[PDB]
Amino acid sequence: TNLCPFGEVFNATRFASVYAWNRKRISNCVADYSVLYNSASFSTFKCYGVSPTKLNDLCFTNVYADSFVIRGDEVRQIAPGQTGKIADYNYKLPDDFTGCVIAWNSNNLDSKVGGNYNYLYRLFRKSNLKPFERDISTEIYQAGSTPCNGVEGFNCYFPLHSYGFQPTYGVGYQPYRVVVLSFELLHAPATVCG
Amino acid sequence: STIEEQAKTFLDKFNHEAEDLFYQSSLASWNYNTNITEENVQNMNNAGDKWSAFLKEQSTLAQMYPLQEIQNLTVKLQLQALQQNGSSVLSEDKSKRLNTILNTMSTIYSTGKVCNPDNPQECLLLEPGLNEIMANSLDYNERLWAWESWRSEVGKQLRPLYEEYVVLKNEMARANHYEDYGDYWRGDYEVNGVDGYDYSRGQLIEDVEHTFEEIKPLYEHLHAYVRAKLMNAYPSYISPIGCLPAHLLGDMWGRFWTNLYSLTVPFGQKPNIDVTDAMVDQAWDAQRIFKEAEKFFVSVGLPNMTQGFWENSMLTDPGNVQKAVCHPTAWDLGKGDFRILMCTKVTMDDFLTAHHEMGHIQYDMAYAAQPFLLRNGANEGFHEAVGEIMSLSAATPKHLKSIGLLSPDFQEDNETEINFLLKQALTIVGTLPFTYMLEKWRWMVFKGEIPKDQWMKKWWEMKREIVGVVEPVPHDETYCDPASLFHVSNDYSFIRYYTRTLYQFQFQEALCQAAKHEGPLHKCDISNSTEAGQKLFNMLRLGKSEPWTLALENVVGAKNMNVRPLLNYFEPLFTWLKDQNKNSFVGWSTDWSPYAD
Numbered sequence: 113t114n115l116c117p118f119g120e121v122f123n124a125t126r127f128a129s130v131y132a133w134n135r136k137r138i139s140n141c142v143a144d145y146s147v148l149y150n151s152a153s154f155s156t157f158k159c160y161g162v163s164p165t166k167l168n169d170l171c172f173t174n175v176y177a178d179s180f181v182i183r184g185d186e187v188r189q190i191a192p193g194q195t196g197k198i199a200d201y202n203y204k205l206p207d208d209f210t211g212c213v214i215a216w217n218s219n220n221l222d223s224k225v226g227g228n229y230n231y232l233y234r235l236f237r238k239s240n241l242k243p244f245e246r247d248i249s250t251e252i253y254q255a256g257s258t259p260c261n262g263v264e265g266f267n268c269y270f271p272l273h274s275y276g277f278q279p280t281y282g283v284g285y286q287p288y289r290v291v292v293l294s295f296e297l298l299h300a301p302a303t304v305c306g
Numbered sequence: 307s308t309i310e311e312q313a314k315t316f317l318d319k320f321n322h323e324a325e326d327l328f329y330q331s332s333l334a335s336w337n338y339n340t341n342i343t344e345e346n347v348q349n350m351n352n353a354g355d356k357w358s359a360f361l362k363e364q365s366t367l368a369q370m371y372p373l374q375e376i377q378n379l380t381v382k383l384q385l386q387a388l389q390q391n392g393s394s395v396l397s398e399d400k401s402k403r404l405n406t407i408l409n410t411m412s413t414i415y416s417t418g419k420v421c422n423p424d425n426p427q428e429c430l431l432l433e434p435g436l437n438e439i440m441a442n443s444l445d446y447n448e449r450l451w452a453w454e455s456w457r458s459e460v461g462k463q464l465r466p467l468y469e470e471y472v473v474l475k476n477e478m479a480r481a482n483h484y485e486d487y488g489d490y491w492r493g494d495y496e497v498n499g500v501d502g503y504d505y506s507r508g509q510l511i512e513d514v515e516h517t518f519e520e521i522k523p524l525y526e527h528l529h530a531y532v533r534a535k536l537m538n539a540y541p542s543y544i545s546p547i548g549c550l551p552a553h554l555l556g557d558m559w560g561r562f563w564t565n566l567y568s569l570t571v572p573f574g575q576k577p578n579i580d581v582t583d584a585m586v587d588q589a590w591d592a593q594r595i596f597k598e599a600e601k602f603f604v605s606v607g608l609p610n611m612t613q614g615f616w617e618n619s620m621l622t623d624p625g626n627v628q629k630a631v632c633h634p635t636a637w638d639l640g641k642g643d644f645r646i647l648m649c650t651k652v653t654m655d656d657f658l659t660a661h662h663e664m665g666h667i668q669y670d671m672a673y674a675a676q677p678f679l680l681r682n683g684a685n686e687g688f689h690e691a692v693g694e695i696m697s698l699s700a701a702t703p704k705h706l707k708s709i710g711l712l713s714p715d716f717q718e719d720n721e722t723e724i725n726f727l728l729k730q731a732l733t734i735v736g737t738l739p740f741t742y743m744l745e746k747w748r749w750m751v752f753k754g755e756i757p758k759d760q761w762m763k764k765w766w767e768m769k770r771e772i773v774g775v776v777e778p779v780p781h782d783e784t785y786c787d788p789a790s791l792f793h794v795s796n797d798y799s800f801i802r803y804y805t806r807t808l809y810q811f812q813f814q815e816a817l818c819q820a821a822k823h824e825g826p827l828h829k830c831d832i833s834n835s836t837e838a839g840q841k842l843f844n845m846l847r848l849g850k851s852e853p854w855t856l857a858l859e860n861v862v863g864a865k866n867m868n869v870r871p872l873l874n875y876f877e878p879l880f881t882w883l884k885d886q887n888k889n890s891f892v893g894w895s896t897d898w899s900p901y902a903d
């Protein structure tokens with residue numbers, strides 16, 4: 113009966129960086145995606161599997177809302193069947209995706225002259241991520257054969273690097289806040305619909 | 307595990323470092339360039355030193371990667387450009403000696419000044435004093451005085467300085483397995499490791515001498531015509547067979563000949579084409595000029611300027627409140643920021659310079675996808691060529707009428723087109739002998755093919771044999787008259803202008819032939835023909851991730867610099883000069899002198 117809390121997640125004031133993409137669970141509520149679809153504020157709105165209208169009158173067991181910030185160009189990499197730094201090392205979308213992808217420009221807040229260095233992304237990794245796996249480690253990267261034991265240097269690299277967000281960036285480099293939704297159906301009753 | 311993947315990882319870190327640091331440096335330099343104060347100088351110099359120190363440290367750290375162990379030619383090109391330590395290889399005392407002599411020469415040239423024997427307190431920097439003196443004053447003695455005075459004041463100073471600089475730079479080049487500094491510069495065109503597209507550094511010299519040999523007739527007839535006109539202007543000074551005295555070349559050295567136009571225009575009663583009045587009478591301002599050039603570039607299918615350019619750039623002089631040194635420049639601040647810095651005075655010349663700089667901006671927008679080290683021209687000459695072709699394609703009378711900015715009934719005729727082509731050939735065809743002569747002299751100097759105490763003796767020789775120039779005053783070995791120039795004194799490569807000029811007309815003719823234009827090449831316009839647009843974009847989007855010969859054949863279908871498009875473009879002018887020259891001797895003797903008569 114009570115409304116789903118899309119408010120506190122969709123436009124709060126501080127999003128989590130991509131490598132620690134903030135996940136939130138949605139259940140036991142009624143959802144109204146119509147304001148979302150007709151908002152016309154998001155400069156990127158795409159998804160795969162359900163119609164933006166029909167999803168309003170459908171019932172699901174649990175919903176998951178991932179949220180983070182990325183660069184402009186790289187927003188395309190959030191899609192089943194892409195590859196790249198965000199799809200390789202930082203986030204994974206399974207090709208059997210079920211949710212939706214919402215992306216809106218964020219040059220409003222997330223950037224400030226002198227560079228906003230609070231947003232990070234994982235630049236190197238030994239292997240590519242699995243679907244919906246999040247890695248927060250920061251162990252120095254063994255680029256060579258000699259182990260490093262936690263030191264920066266030749267063939268020993270730091271695995272996190274900071275987005276140099278500024279307000280004077282092109283459209284492909286101004287930040288972009290992104291929310292990705294997924295639904296799942298199980299044996300239990302579908303407590304999420306409206 | 308291997309060397310390839312590890313160099314991959316390393317460069318993948320070096321990018322996301324150098325991008326940020328280069329943004330900081332370039333943004334600080336921009337803030338300085340629009341608002342000249344002390345604190346901006348501070349921020350700019352600190353950020354620039356930080357960036358340069360990062361670059362040096364990264365070069366040193368990168369030389370630990372074995373080059374020949376690399377196959378993927380992108381990684382090999384980036385590693386080659388990065389690992390070249392350069393001046394960082396000398397002994398530190400020698401490095402400080404280099405910086406010392408460089409700063410002395412640069413500052414001496416940037417502040418040197420001259421005045422007549424009558425008022426030792428009323429005197430001028432070259433710009434704009436000696437500039438306008440050589441540019442508009444028609445007094446023979448005045449111009450000769452300016453000539454000898456500027457050739458004596460900075461020349462004798464930098465002469466031994468330039469000797470020492472040549473020595474130290476030869477050492478710097480030989481340190482990194484480059485036979486001399488000339489070869490170091492030529493190492494920009496060098497291409498290896500690609501079958502059917504390799505290019506050796508001496509192959510460049512061969513090609514340049516070749517192309518100049520074929521251009522020689524056009525320039526010789528141009529010089530004959532101009533000598534005839536100047537004899538009609540200064541008969542008591544020029545020989546009907548002797549070379550042209552340099553101090554009449556509409557400039558202190560003759561980099562261009564533009565200022566001779568009014569002095570040599572054939573049909574001096576013809577109203578020249580100029581839309582200045584037509585521009586102002588329609589309330590044309592900065593925003594309008596640049597919107598028009600942007601609409602041009604959209605016409606041929608290239609993408610249009612992102613909003614950042616309209617918001618951030620400086621199109622209009624910032625009044626008298628704050629000052630800026632607005633030589634018209636285009637800035638790629640990286641990370642998707644493009645700007646233009648220009649004090650646009652509403653004229654025609656500026657309506658062309660706007661197209662030129664916006665073409666630079668288009669070329670930079672094209673290859674924002676290539677990794678950092680490749681975000682540049684394919685060679686040191688593609689940028690200015692891609693710039694110039696747009697200006698010459700949008701300066702045509704047909705295009706001018708197309709935007710209504712010209713009276714639709716202005717009638718093209720032989721007279722106006724000969725005037726237009728003479729303007730062009732005085733701008734472009736005049737500068738090629740000068741560029742080639744100077745670069746060849748500097749190469750020969752660096753190769754040790756000349757004793758030092760003989761430099762000047764050889765220098766004016768080549769002009770006497772190439773550019774038809776003769777000095778009105780005997781200059782001895784204490785001068786270093788070439789040093790009196792910007793690029794000579796500031797140590798810049800100078801053949802990029804030759805390569806720009808020739809690639810310009812290759813590109814222009816290929817693009818027109820892609821637009822199915824019928825008629826003379828000069829009246830061609832590329833507008834509304836998306837075919838030429840895509841044909842050019844297929845070369846733009848590469849950067850330097852490919853050998854320049856490959857990107858050149860992607861457009862002109864040739865594999866080398868080739869003059870034939872130039873001669874094609876100038877054919878009507880060449881015929882007209884052949885008619886006009888039947889009454890004058892073409893060529894020059896090498897013994898006639900203005901001072902030893």
Ligand SMILES: *[C@@H]1O[C@H](CO)[C@@H](O)[C@H](O)[C@H]1NC(C)=O
Pocket residue numbers: 118119122123147148151153154
């Ligand atoms: C949150 O506020 C922003 C800014 O007005 C708006 O774009 C967005 O649509 C809002 N969220 C929802 C769910 O409408």
Ligand SMILES: *[C@@H]1O[C@H](CO)[C@@H](O)[C@H](O)[C@H]1NC(C)=O
Pocket residue numbers: 341343345628
């Ligand atoms: C120019 O620089 C000065 C010194 O920092 C600054 O006070 C001024 O605001 C700048 N000009 C503009 C238009 O911001």
Ligand SMILES: *[C@@H]1O[C@H](CO)[C@@H](O)[C@H](O)[C@H]1NC(C)=O
Pocket residue numbers: 378379380381
């Ligand atoms: C060379 O490396 C780039 C990425 O740096 C890659 O896209 C390209 O495929 C590589 N070349 C070959 C022949 O695999």
Ligand SMILES: *[C@@H]1O[C@H](CO)[C@@H](O)[C@H](O)[C@H]1NC(C)=O
Pocket residue numbers: 604610611612613
């Ligand atoms: C560039 O041209 C396209 C043509 O479809 C247009 O949609 C777009 O708005 C133009 N860009 C700008 C910044 O106006």
Ligand SMILES: *[C@@H]1O[C@H](CO)[C@@H](O)[C@H](O)[C@H]1NC(C)=O
Pocket residue numbers: 605704705708709831833834
């Ligand atoms: C280009 O096409 C537009 C629209 O078709 C037209 O208004 C303009 O005059 C054309 N310009 C040229 C140079 O063909």
